[PDB]
């Protein structure tokens, strides 16, 4: 079971990844950039004896996980903010020497 | 698409509801108490046309919704607190003048 | 075959039932409130020799029927109007001593 | 979803169409005579956003529509009268100078 | 269940319809010519309490019915005779200004 | 293809057979009493070649046939009358010196 | 749907038929002995407008019916009593000149 | 095998149960009122070994049984009368101080 | 595998049985009339070492057999001739005191 | 489970029934002659509770039973002898004054 | 339907064909020798209309037919004899100057 | 089995029918013009009994037949010529005073 | 494979056909009005050796074709313009002496 | 996997629950009465390294569990004894003001 | 698709092949006798641009083809005539020194 | 097909085999003890021409057979008696030096 | 239904059987040692008729039974102790003078 | 629904894309060059509500869309010309300094 | 999942077992000889937190296990060497007093 995720392009220079991580905390998330690939890794730090007597129902599941995504050379990350249960990660890279849309003919 | 939810019962007089609500603004959320029944209604306040060309992938779902639960008399809500995209709703009550958890004989 | 029917809530104090009854007349409909249940009953008063020679096609069917619906204690009916082939029945009851929607926390 | 309809023929020169149209306003309805063909077009003039939370149940359908029938020459419409949600449309004509319904021999 | 029926052409000017109507009587059959169509209609005039104690077996069924057949303009009926359980109806019309079969070539 | 048939029993000593025989000439029909058994044999006396081009439709069937029924001793035939294409055959007998239809006690 | 029925032999001279006929009355049942066969016939004498409003549920069905059973020559009926919803019919006949069970050998 | 049963409701305060119980002796029958619930228990008091050689056919079933129904407060039984193998049980009650069966408006 | 057989009626007094018995001989066939039943019995008298080397193909099979047929009282056999591989057996009995075919009515 | 049985016919006047009845005591067996019909009824007189722990295997079946056969008039039983667990029952009769087993012609 | 046939080979120079032909007249039969091939053609000379009412059963088949067999050079027919409904056809030939059936060594 | 047919249209006023009719004699063929409809009726004038022994193979079919086509007013037949087993039938007409095949604009 | 096509009504006097014909040229399209029917016909004028070496992929197919559509009497074509790969054909006809939509009653 | 369980009624005032709990100990079982519901909860207190080398086979499984059962108001528990691997729990409540079974009528 | 074909034997000396070849011409058919085999070969000499605009329907297909048939040594062809769309080819060969049909025996 | 068989233990020292062998005789059964295995062998000594004419029906089958059963060392047979179609064989062996059932603990 | 069982082996000379036996009285239980084989036979000493009306639910099964296990020589039983519904049976033995669990080399 | 497209490659340095875009306005079309990738995005600028009553048929599809293709370095677009509803897009490039198409040896 | 294993016979006195145990160590393997059976037992001594971040892929699985094999009396083990991931175990036993292969005859 993996957390929901989206990717948008702010521009040719921009990728933005949005991941749903409810209950996920500052200490619980660690990320690494290795060999042109970005890895986003969740870990539940520890277990708590959960009284199955205490809870009648659970529909919400979280699991430790790692996500891997190949990054185009040569990429730079702008910011990562966790707000409203959302992980927003800003990533910058560009200059293929073509941003330019143009034509018309007849 | 409906949000996953967990419900905890702390004691004979109290249970706790846990709802995953990522990306949701308090401004998007409304709650109602009617006839001993709790209705939780999410409303996305407004939408913005986004060019799907700019969005490469969407795994994350957004929808307006309503949930309903009949609560036994006589109910009072303690707190509903939103943190890191989760809604925790405190519910405390009971009085049938019996809590008593004991016996064995022979 | 039963007539189409809808139910809306004007407020906690209000239920509104809308039933489609084309061709249904003042004398043809009788309703009764018994044991906390509302019964809406149609009866075709009588038969008319119908010349099957006279009509080539019929798509519209009506049948004698009774509808039964359990009413929450302790209910009162406001009005019932038959207009434009519609049966509109206004029903009032309330005061669980909770109309009140409220909360926010953090 | 299309409305059930009945068609009656009173005589060699006359038939009658019966349409179920509950909740419909005359203001919502348009009829057209074109090329010996009758077109009956319902149009819901406008809609109102209704919160489905307020509506518990809908069995009753609402839609804009058009119906078409080629009518043999030479047709004239007598009346279309709307009562208790039904549309009765009067159609009278024929002249092939032959009505004659009789014979037997041996 | 409909009675057996046949159609023969005596000539370009002639159609002959033969229908099996055992037990069918002078009063029981009525026919009508309307709008270029011929209708042949059976009616059992009435019911007779039939003692199901009186009859052990029945293989022969009769039912009230109407038959409709589009007639080419401009048609005239010659005779209808009921004999030996047979309905024979003679119908005349002609003069397309071609009765004429002819050719040979090489 | 065999003709539909009905059999009526008027009393302990009498039953009546009803046969549908449209288009049949008495000249086409033969009956036989052999060994307490009744044999009803239809024979179409002769056929005429008809050009199927002149006949557009045939729903009506014509065939030679024989029917057989063992009748309990001691049988005598009263009448067989042909009217409007139906054959009614009268059969009267019995003598086990017992007709008696009655009793109840307690 | 036919009423439950049983047959027992009191002796070589005796048959006893037991039929369940709840709600069946003195006037409602008529029996006849004809041609060595016994017929037991129920008839509901008449209909009563039954208010389908008056009854919510019926599991018990009764229908008009006739039962026929071939009787060995030469049979005599002793008694028929209706008691506790039961139809008991006593029937006597005998004397094949063998009642006699006997043998042993070696 | 359980007995067919019918239930009639004579009025807002009264309903009637109809049970088919052929061959049953009052001595075989027991009824019980416990917690607002009616239990109807048939008990065949005793059995007699019957030689199945003497019994040629059994269509009629015999079994001990119990039936249960929760009855809304506050119930009182009027009569249970056994006639011609049927048990009719009278049940009368209600008091929510509302019988009122009327309205229409416009 | 049984030999082909046919039965014809020469008259009410006559039955004729024809059985195919190729290779069947005078000594090989024996018949018996017992208890109103006729039995026709074939027996291959003996075996002959058959050289399976001598014959490449056989399509014709014969087997020892017995045929049994219930004869109406009180029957007499006229003649049995074996000719051209055919068994022809003539059987006479009659006089139900009905040979007589007759009727016509109207 | 019913016993295998063989039936032999020694002559036109006599047939012999062979029944396998191992472990059966003559004391367990009863025979009856009723209405020209033979009934053979085995009855195990009594059973003894046997501990299935002491019995490792049972392939052999034991049951009470009744068999029935209609015998044509006029029947007399000669002998029924039980030897080495088999019941042989002698049956001799006939007199239609015809035994005659012969003819052939040409 | 084709007749069963057997073929026997008496020696290297001779084989024998056996055909079942019951009811066949020599007058019905024709044989032909063409191109070293034998053709056996049965022809039923003529038919007689038989009333199927007089014939109760037919198991025996009658049809005209032709059979063909290529025979190796150089063939001569010895005899074809018809007895008790069987056709035996004698065929003798061969000369490849080799009959010799022997050897073994080591 | 019906003959393959081709239909050619030479112009707005003319179409040509092509029928394959091998082995057919003009003497076998009849054509008819009735009510603006063309009927083409083949009739094999007579048949000759052919011994199927003389015929080794038949792939070629022979049957009497009729074909029908409604032709729009106002039709005249030009020629029907039979050559090398094909029937070519010339049909010329039209006059709605419009042939005109042209336009394009911008 | 046929080109996409649409039909709209500008009024009772108007039909407009829109066909997609990319790559279709002035010389390539020819239309004809014959017998009340309009035919729109494409023809690729000629072939060009297409180097299958020159093109790696083709998703767009064009084929020679003809479209036929029955035109109501008595029709006139206004204009046909090929613009933006679109064929727009304007067609006029009218005057059934009914353009008139009207009614309301009660 | 849950332990086997039974429920008996000693009287209107009595329920008795019997649960099979082999190996279950004094410390291992805890029960609680909360909100009109009784919960019976097993817990294995701890784990013991089980040598899978030590045991070749186990057919008996025990698991930690909780059972929940809604109790009618207003209930009292008498005794709970663990004997012979059985959990017996006595529960008392009553006085609907009907213990009373009674009736007979006619 | 191959043309229909038949083969008949005029005598032992004769084969006759009949092939349907409508539209097939003098120049279009060529035949060859090679190695004891006869080959009949059709060729459409050439193609004609066929206006698919000119013909609405074709049911008749012709294709170039070759037929091959092994001829018994030593064969001679008499005549080949194309008449009425028929190819008739006369072929002679004989003298196996057996034309002779003969036998009868007993 | 093998005869029914049972095995019981009279004690640790005892096995008893019971086999059903109806019609089986003193001379017909031979048994042998070989290599610790007991073999029970039936043989029908000889055949008797059985007239299939003499018997109409046989349900009882017997076949020659041998049964083999491994015997525990070191076994001794007590007695074998054939009575009432039963083969009873007494077999003794024992002394594992444990006959002894005992224990109780706590 | 057979009881779940576990078997433990404490050492080379000893294994332990664990049986679940809830509700069982020692008085109900019997054990036997025969031929090195252990037989455990439960016997419910007697039953009491319980009214299933008093018993609302039964999940718990009660049956008499026997279990068998061949035990290798030379076996002795240590103890069988019943506690909290479990039977633990101690079995100790072996002497093949080899326990030795060790080696490794290279 | 996506538009059919063809792609042509004129030479090692050049390929041509062919897109079908009927009814499309240049004003509706946008193209983009990003990261060596070509994106072709159609956008219908705006829509007009059309009454589907006026439109009898739609086979022609209209939708906004985006297409994407990674183009190998180093790409430059020559022309994109729209004619008669087709978009032809010119793409020229390559320089791996190798075009050479030749050799053969031996 | 169990490790691959092979068994070879060096001679009548010899068995050799070869087991694949990659990664298996001196401390990890323990074997025991008990009751004529050899047990080979693997145990992973302990767990190591394995970083699932550290390893992307594993195809090689090892599990704790025990193997059991019945040894013929009276067996002796020679050597066990772990080399190249192989477990080689030498086992000796012999002297059935037959090693001897011999024979030829005629």
Numbering used by the authors:
A (entry chain B), B (entry chain A), C (entry chain B), D (entry chain A), E (entry chain B), F (entry chain A), ...: 40 to 145
What sentences appear in the manuscript?
The construct AgsA:DelC formed only 24-mers in solution. AgsA:DelC, differing from AgsA:DD only in the N-terminus, formed 24-mers similar to those formed by M. jannaschii Hsp16.5 (MjHsp16.5). Cubic crystals of AgsA:DelC in the I23 space group diffracted to 4.1 Å resolution. The application of crystal symmetry on the MR solution of a dimer in the ASU yielded an octahedral 24-mer, similar to the assembly of MjHsp16.5 and S. tokodaii Hsp14. Though the search model lacked both termini for both protomers, successive rounds of refinement yielded clear density into which we could build the C-terminal extensions of both subunits. These termini containing the IXI motifs (residues 143–145: Ile-Ala-Ile), bind in the hydrophobic groove present between strands β4 and β8 of a neighbouring dimer related by a crystallographic 2-fold axis. As observed for MjHsp16.5 wild type and its N-terminal variant, this AgsA oligomer is also charged on the outside and hydrophobic inside. The C-terminal extension in the AgsA:DelC construct forms crucial interactions to enable its assembly into a 24-mer. Constructs possessing an intact N-terminal domain (AgsA wild type and AgsA:DelC) were better at preventing the aggregation of chemically denatured lysozyme.
